[PDB]
Amino acid sequence: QQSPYSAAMAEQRHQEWLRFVDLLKNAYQNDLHLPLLNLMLLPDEREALGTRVRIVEELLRGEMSQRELKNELGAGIAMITRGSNYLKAAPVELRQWLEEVLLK
Amino acid sequence: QSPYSAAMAEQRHQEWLRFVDLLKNAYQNDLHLPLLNLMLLPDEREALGTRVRIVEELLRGEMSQRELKNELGAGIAMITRGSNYLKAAPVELRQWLEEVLL
C-alpha cells in the first residue's frame, strides 16, 4: 500500500506521464515529433538522450572498453554501472529488441 | 564555426535523430513504455509530464502566474522560457497543440 498523500501525488504524476506519452505517440503519427521534442526537451537534454543510446548500444555490443566509454561517450564507472543496472532491470523483451535494432 | 565544431555538431544531430527513430520504432512495437523507463530517470519523466501541463496552461491563457507557480512549480523564468519555445515552434505544431491540449 501507500499513504494517501504519496498515492495522490503518484497518481497525478502517472496521469501526467501518460498524457506526455500519448501526446508524443500522436505527434509521431502526424509527423510533428521533431518540433514537439524540440519544445519539450532542452538542447543539452536531447544530446544526453542521443549519448545514452550510444552507451546502451556499446554496453550491449560488449566491445568498447571502460576507458573508451569514458573518453568517447563521457561515461565513467558510476554511469556505466547505472546503465548496466537499467538494462538488467528492463524486461527481457526490450533487451532482445534493442539488440536487434541497435546491433543490426 | 570551425570544421571540428561543425563535425561534432553534425554527429550530435545524427545521434539525436537515432534516438528519435528508435523511439518511433518502439511505439510501433508497443515497447515505448519500457524504453522510456530505460532512457529517462524518474525525475526526468516527471519533468516532462509537468512541461506538458505548462505548455497547455500557457496556450489556454487562463491560469495566472501565481497559479502556474503553485500548481505546476513554474516560476517566472520558466514561464518566459516556455513561452519562447512555443513562439519559436512551427505553426503546425502550435495549431495541433491547441487542438489536442485544449
Ligand SMILES: O=C(O)Cc1c[nH]c2ccccc12
Ligand atoms: O526551460 C526549462 O526549464 C525546461 C523546459 C523545456 N521545455 C519546456 C516547456 C515548458 C516549460 C519548461 C520547459
Ligand SMILES: O=C(O)Cc1c[nH]c2ccccc12
Ligand atoms: O543514470 C544516468 O546518469 C542517466 C541515464 C538514464 N538512462 C541511462 C542509460 C544509459 C546511461 C545513462 C543513463
